[PDB]
Short mmCIF file of C-alpha atoms and ligand atoms in Angstrom, two decimals:
data_model
loop_
_atom_site.label_atom_id
_atom_site.label_comp_id
_atom_site.label_asym_id
_atom_site.label_seq_id
_atom_site.Cartn_x
_atom_site.Cartn_y
_atom_site.Cartn_z
CA UNK A 1 20.46 3.70 9.49
CA UNK A 2 20.68 5.05 13.04
CA UNK A 3 20.81 2.63 16.00
CA UNK A 4 18.38 3.94 18.62
CA UNK A 5 18.18 2.65 22.20
CA UNK A 6 14.82 1.41 23.50
CA UNK A 7 14.81 4.01 26.32
CA UNK A 8 15.27 6.85 23.75
CA UNK A 9 12.25 5.65 21.74
CA UNK A 10 10.25 5.10 24.95
CA UNK A 11 10.94 8.73 25.94
CA UNK A 12 10.08 10.35 22.54
CA UNK A 13 6.70 8.54 22.48
CA UNK A 14 5.71 9.43 26.13
CA UNK A 15 6.37 5.81 27.27
CA UNK A 16 4.57 4.52 24.10
CA UNK A 17 1.36 6.34 25.05
CA UNK A 18 -1.49 4.16 23.69
CA UNK A 19 -4.05 7.00 23.61
CA UNK A 20 -4.91 8.64 20.25
CA UNK A 21 -5.44 12.39 19.44
CA UNK A 22 1.01 9.03 20.90
CA UNK A 23 -0.80 6.17 19.13
CA UNK A 24 -1.18 6.92 15.41
CA UNK A 25 -2.53 3.56 14.31
CA UNK A 26 -1.87 -0.12 13.93
CA UNK A 27 0.75 -1.13 11.37
CA UNK A 28 1.21 -4.61 9.86
CA UNK A 29 2.79 -6.24 12.91
CA UNK A 30 2.51 -3.70 15.69
CA UNK A 31 1.43 -0.24 16.79
CA UNK A 32 2.75 2.99 15.24
CA UNK A 33 3.57 5.87 17.62
CA UNK A 34 4.34 9.55 16.87
CA UNK A 35 7.72 10.76 18.08
CA UNK A 36 10.23 13.63 17.81
CA UNK A 37 14.03 13.73 17.53
CA UNK A 38 15.75 17.07 16.57
CA UNK A 39 12.46 18.83 15.70
CA UNK A 40 11.83 16.11 13.04
CA UNK A 41 8.57 14.25 13.55
CA UNK A 42 9.07 10.48 13.24
CA UNK A 43 6.95 7.30 13.25
CA UNK A 44 7.99 4.48 15.59
CA UNK A 45 6.63 1.03 14.81
CA UNK A 46 6.76 -1.05 17.98
CA UNK A 47 6.50 -4.74 16.97
CA UNK A 48 11.39 -15.62 15.81
CA UNK A 49 9.13 -14.93 12.77
CA UNK A 50 8.70 -11.30 13.96
CA UNK A 51 12.51 -10.91 14.31
CA UNK A 52 12.96 -12.22 10.73
CA UNK A 53 10.41 -9.66 9.44
CA UNK A 54 12.30 -6.88 11.33
CA UNK A 55 15.55 -8.03 9.62
CA UNK A 56 13.90 -8.26 6.17
CA UNK A 57 12.56 -4.70 6.53
CA UNK A 58 16.11 -3.40 7.29
CA UNK A 59 17.73 -5.49 4.47
CA UNK A 60 15.22 -4.36 1.78
CA UNK A 61 15.44 -0.69 2.88
CA UNK A 62 19.25 -0.88 2.80
CA UNK A 63 19.18 -1.91 -0.89
CA UNK A 64 16.05 -0.06 -2.09
CA UNK A 65 15.91 3.77 -2.03
CA UNK A 66 13.42 5.50 -4.34
CA UNK A 67 11.16 8.61 -4.18
CA UNK A 68 8.11 6.30 -4.08
CA UNK A 69 9.29 4.09 -1.18
CA UNK A 70 9.22 5.00 2.54
CA UNK A 71 12.52 5.93 4.19
CA UNK A 72 13.73 3.98 7.20
CA UNK A 73 15.65 6.25 9.59
CA UNK A 74 16.69 3.68 12.16
CA UNK A 75 15.88 0.80 14.48
CA UNK A 76 16.25 -0.62 18.06
CA UNK A 77 11.27 -0.99 16.95
CA UNK A 78 11.59 0.61 13.48
CA UNK A 79 11.83 4.41 13.02
CA UNK A 80 10.67 6.18 9.86
CA UNK A 81 10.23 9.72 8.63
CA UNK A 82 6.67 10.68 9.61
CA UNK A 83 4.36 10.78 6.56
CA UNK A 84 2.12 13.80 7.22
CA UNK A 85 -0.83 12.51 5.16
CA UNK A 86 -0.92 8.95 6.53
CA UNK A 87 -2.17 6.12 4.32
CA UNK A 88 -4.02 6.11 0.98
CA UNK A 89 -6.60 3.78 2.69
CA UNK A 90 -7.42 6.49 5.25
CA UNK A 91 -7.38 9.34 2.77
CA UNK A 92 -9.79 7.40 0.50
CA UNK A 93 -12.17 6.97 3.48
CA UNK A 94 -11.62 10.59 4.69
CA UNK A 95 -10.71 9.29 8.17
CA UNK A 96 -10.61 12.02 10.85
CA UNK A 97 -12.32 14.51 8.51
CA UNK A 98 -9.62 14.94 5.88
CA UNK A 99 -11.01 16.25 2.54
CA UNK A 100 -11.65 13.79 -0.31
CA UNK A 101 -8.76 13.34 -2.78
CA UNK A 102 -9.36 14.87 -6.20
CA UNK A 103 -9.19 12.71 -9.35
CA UNK A 104 -6.04 14.67 -10.29
CA UNK A 105 -4.32 13.75 -6.95
CA UNK A 106 -5.56 10.13 -7.34
CA UNK A 107 -3.87 9.84 -10.78
CA UNK A 108 -0.55 11.11 -9.35
CA UNK A 109 -0.77 8.74 -6.41
CA UNK A 110 -1.51 5.78 -8.74
CA UNK A 111 1.47 6.72 -10.94
CA UNK A 112 3.76 7.11 -7.93
CA UNK A 113 2.73 3.77 -6.43
CA UNK A 114 3.41 2.02 -9.80
CA UNK A 115 6.86 3.74 -10.01
CA UNK A 116 7.62 2.39 -6.51
CA UNK A 117 6.54 -1.18 -7.39
CA UNK A 118 8.51 -0.95 -10.67
CA UNK A 119 11.62 0.03 -8.71
CA UNK A 120 11.16 -2.99 -6.36
CA UNK A 121 10.62 -5.43 -9.28
CA UNK A 122 13.60 -3.99 -11.25
CA UNK A 123 15.66 -4.70 -8.10
CA UNK A 124 14.29 -8.33 -8.05
CA UNK A 125 12.04 -7.93 -4.99
CA UNK A 126 8.42 -9.15 -4.57
CA UNK A 127 6.58 -7.01 -1.98
CA UNK A 128 3.84 -9.64 -1.14
CA UNK A 129 1.52 -7.18 0.71
CA UNK A 130 0.54 -4.47 -1.75
CA UNK A 131 -2.55 -2.70 -0.44
CA UNK A 132 -3.77 0.88 0.13
CA UNK A 133 -2.85 0.73 3.88
CA UNK A 134 0.78 0.16 2.65
CA UNK A 135 0.81 3.25 0.41
CA UNK A 136 1.73 6.26 2.52
CA UNK A 137 1.45 9.92 1.59
CA UNK A 138 4.03 12.59 2.35
CA UNK A 139 3.60 16.42 2.75
CA UNK A 140 2.99 16.77 -1.06
CA UNK A 141 0.77 13.60 -1.32
CA UNK A 142 3.61 11.64 -2.99
CA UNK A 143 2.86 7.88 -2.80
CA UNK A 144 5.36 5.87 -0.79
CA UNK A 145 5.25 2.03 -0.72
CA UNK A 146 5.74 0.78 2.85
CA UNK A 147 6.08 -2.44 4.88
CA UNK A 148 8.76 -4.67 3.34
CA UNK A 149 8.69 -7.19 6.25
CA UNK A 150 7.23 -9.88 3.94
CA UNK A 151 9.34 -8.96 0.87
CA UNK A 152 11.24 -11.74 -0.99
CA UNK A 153 14.38 -11.34 -3.13
CA UNK A 154 6.77 -19.28 -9.83
CA UNK A 155 8.21 -20.66 -6.38
CA UNK A 156 5.99 -22.04 -3.53
CA UNK A 157 5.79 -21.58 0.28
CA UNK A 158 4.04 -23.23 3.26
CA UNK A 159 3.53 -19.93 5.15
CA UNK A 160 0.90 -18.08 3.07
CA UNK A 161 0.99 -14.39 4.02
CA UNK A 162 -0.71 -11.20 2.79
CA UNK A 163 -4.15 -9.53 2.91
CA UNK A 164 -6.92 -11.82 1.57
CA UNK A 165 -9.01 -9.08 -0.20
CA UNK A 166 -5.92 -8.04 -2.25
CA UNK A 167 -4.47 -11.53 -2.94
CA UNK A 168 -4.18 -13.13 -6.32
CA UNK A 169 -5.57 -16.72 -6.62
CA UNK A 170 -2.07 -18.24 -6.98
CA UNK A 171 -0.83 -16.30 -3.89
CA UNK A 172 -3.74 -17.80 -1.86
CA UNK A 173 -2.45 -21.28 -2.98
CA UNK A 174 1.16 -20.61 -1.86
CA UNK A 175 2.88 -19.26 -4.99
CA UNK A 176 5.39 -16.36 -4.72
CA UNK A 177 5.60 -14.32 -7.94
CA UNK A 178 5.84 -10.60 -8.84
CA UNK A 179 2.59 -11.24 -10.85
CA UNK A 180 0.78 -11.44 -7.47
CA UNK A 181 1.95 -7.84 -6.69
CA UNK A 182 0.39 -6.74 -10.06
CA UNK A 183 -2.96 -8.33 -9.08
CA UNK A 184 -2.90 -6.56 -5.65
CA UNK A 185 -2.09 -3.24 -7.32
CA UNK A 186 -5.19 -3.81 -9.52
CA UNK A 187 -7.28 -3.93 -6.32
CA UNK A 188 -5.62 -0.67 -5.17
CA UNK A 189 -6.53 0.96 -8.50
CA UNK A 190 -10.18 -0.09 -7.92
CA UNK A 191 -10.03 1.49 -4.42
CA UNK A 192 -8.69 4.72 -5.98
CA UNK A 193 -11.48 4.81 -8.61
CA UNK A 194 -14.38 3.91 -6.30
CA UNK A 195 -13.26 5.17 -2.88
CA UNK A 196 -14.47 1.81 -1.49
CA UNK A 197 -12.41 -0.43 0.81
CA UNK A 198 -11.24 -3.78 -0.74
CA UNK A 199 -13.45 -5.69 1.69
CA UNK A 200 -16.56 -4.60 3.57
CA UNK A 201 -18.42 -7.29 5.51
CA UNK A 202 -21.57 -5.07 5.58
CA UNK A 203 -21.51 -4.52 1.76
CA UNK A 204 -22.76 -6.44 -1.34
CA UNK A 205 -20.44 -7.44 -3.01
CA UNK A 206 -18.13 -7.89 -0.01
CA UNK A 207 -14.97 -7.99 -2.14
CA UNK A 208 -14.20 -5.03 -4.39
CA UNK A 209 -12.52 -7.23 -7.05
CA UNK A 210 -15.99 -8.75 -7.71
CA UNK A 211 -17.09 -5.47 -9.41
CA UNK A 212 -14.81 -6.40 -12.38
CA UNK A 213 -17.11 -9.36 -13.03
CA UNK A 214 -20.27 -7.20 -12.58
CA UNK A 215 -18.95 -4.73 -15.20
CA UNK A 216 -17.89 -7.50 -17.64
CA UNK A 217 -21.29 -9.23 -17.29
CA UNK A 218 -22.92 -5.75 -17.85
CA UNK A 219 -24.90 -5.91 -14.56
CA UNK A 220 -23.20 -2.51 -13.71
CA UNK A 221 -20.87 0.05 -15.37
CA UNK A 222 -17.62 1.69 -14.06
CA UNK A 223 -19.70 4.95 -13.84
CA UNK A 224 -22.00 3.31 -11.25
CA UNK A 225 -18.93 2.77 -9.02
CA UNK A 226 -16.86 5.99 -9.59
CA UNK A 227 -16.30 7.76 -6.21
CA UNK A 228 -19.01 10.44 -5.93
CA UNK A 229 -16.72 12.48 -3.59
CA UNK A 230 -14.89 13.94 -6.67
CA UNK A 231 -15.90 16.78 -8.95
CA UNK A 232 -12.98 16.56 -11.49
CA UNK A 233 -13.16 12.97 -12.84
CA UNK A 234 -13.53 12.47 -16.61
CA UNK A 235 -14.80 9.26 -18.23
CA UNK A 236 -11.76 8.86 -20.49
CA UNK A 237 -9.08 8.86 -17.76
CA UNK A 238 -11.32 6.91 -15.34
CA UNK A 239 -11.94 4.28 -18.03
CA UNK A 240 -8.21 4.14 -18.83
CA UNK A 241 -7.37 3.51 -15.12
CA UNK A 242 -10.16 0.89 -14.91
CA UNK A 243 -8.66 -0.82 -18.01
CA UNK A 244 -5.29 -1.07 -16.19
CA UNK A 245 -7.06 -2.44 -13.05
CA UNK A 246 -9.00 -4.97 -15.19
CA UNK A 247 -5.71 -6.17 -16.85
CA UNK A 248 -4.00 -6.47 -13.45
CA UNK A 249 -6.95 -8.50 -12.10
CA UNK A 250 -6.69 -11.28 -14.74
CA UNK A 251 -7.19 -14.65 -12.96
CA UNK A 252 -4.37 -16.23 -15.06
CA UNK A 253 -1.07 -14.73 -13.74
CA UNK A 254 0.75 -14.97 -17.09
CA UNK A 255 -2.02 -12.91 -18.80
CA UNK A 256 -1.41 -9.92 -16.43
CA UNK A 257 0.87 -7.10 -17.65
CA UNK A 258 4.29 -6.59 -16.02
CA UNK A 259 4.83 -3.52 -13.77
CA UNK A 260 6.69 -1.67 -16.59
CA UNK A 261 3.58 -2.07 -18.82
CA UNK A 262 1.27 -0.90 -15.95
CA UNK A 263 3.57 2.10 -15.40
CA UNK A 264 3.43 2.87 -19.16
CA UNK A 265 -0.41 2.62 -19.26
CA UNK A 266 -0.79 4.96 -16.22
CA UNK A 267 1.58 7.52 -17.86
CA UNK A 268 -0.35 7.46 -21.16
CA UNK A 269 -3.58 8.07 -19.11
CA UNK A 270 -2.44 11.64 -18.21
C1 B7R B 1 -5.97 14.00 10.32
N1 B7R B 1 -4.55 13.65 10.20
C2 B7R B 1 -4.09 13.07 11.48
C3 B7R B 1 -2.65 12.53 11.40
C4 B7R B 1 -2.57 11.59 10.23
N2 B7R B 1 -1.48 10.64 10.15
C5 B7R B 1 -0.22 10.81 9.65
C6 B7R B 1 0.38 9.57 9.78
N3 B7R B 1 1.64 9.24 9.43
C7 B7R B 1 2.19 7.96 9.33
N4 B7R B 1 1.42 6.91 9.64
C8 B7R B 1 1.92 5.68 9.58
N5 B7R B 1 1.10 4.58 9.92
C9 B7R B 1 -0.37 4.73 9.98
C10 B7R B 1 -1.06 4.97 8.67
C11 B7R B 1 -1.04 5.30 11.21
C12 B7R B 1 -1.10 3.82 10.93
C13 B7R B 1 3.24 5.50 9.19
C14 B7R B 1 3.89 4.17 9.09
O1 B7R B 1 3.25 3.17 9.35
N6 B7R B 1 5.20 4.14 8.69
C15 B7R B 1 5.76 2.88 8.36
C16 B7R B 1 5.58 1.77 9.15
N7 B7R B 1 6.09 0.57 8.85
C17 B7R B 1 6.80 0.54 7.71
N8 B7R B 1 7.10 1.55 6.88
C18 B7R B 1 6.55 2.72 7.24
C19 B7R B 1 5.89 5.29 8.39
C20 B7R B 1 5.34 6.51 8.46
C21 B7R B 1 3.96 6.63 8.87
N9 B7R B 1 3.46 7.86 8.93
C22 B7R B 1 -0.61 8.74 10.35
N10 B7R B 1 -1.75 9.39 10.57
C23 B7R B 1 -2.99 12.23 8.92
C24 B7R B 1 -4.43 12.73 9.06
#
């Protein structure tokens, strides 16, 4: 990774200009700014606990390199290769007027995200903050898992971290297990199918994971929730992705499939 000076990063972002269209958005623990180097567009995340998360991000990126993981370019502030299509969260909501993702693109993105998580778990890493805001999309809409500041290389902690609407029950109690990442990925799969955010305070139900119970109790069907901003979805593949999401969202962690099984199920879907 390249060691950048703070004044270099200050200059490439127009003194960290907070106005939107150098401000691109708000990342996990700071603001993300658009920058340039040698004609390459980059993303600059300007951030004791925070220093440890900065170090963890560098350490995990040093060990983990995969097509479905973001690429860290350097640090001072963390510098990444700019992902032209932003986050899956924003593309699902069509933020800034971007066109809705097709069912075909959604399947590829789901497969890519699972391949990324599989790579992290094979390398004995638990992400701990799997969510659609942490799935970035490059120039070809390839899914890239981001934000390894909370990553860790059964087991409990006193500092419970993560995003509540995506968290497994045992993660909310303090457990650290790769099974919690599977549960969070199940919520992401529901966001892909429905186009709905994981939590909406002005919606009933507020939490997206609650639709699993509505479908099981036959109060609603998966068809009632399928994103209407698609013209190419088919019941068979949608139902197969919902079946993976349902398995991931099992309340008992040991009943959930491992990431290799999730990856297999998503491959058989297409
Ligand atoms: C209409 N059109 C306008 C421009 C737009 N757009 C492109 C982008 N690119 C973009 N955004 C990011 N962050 C946000 C999602 C903005 C919050 C990041 C990012 O956070 N990291 C990152 C941070 N920490 C750890 N690992 C990776 C790396 C790359 C990256 N790249 C944003 N918006 C697309 C739609």
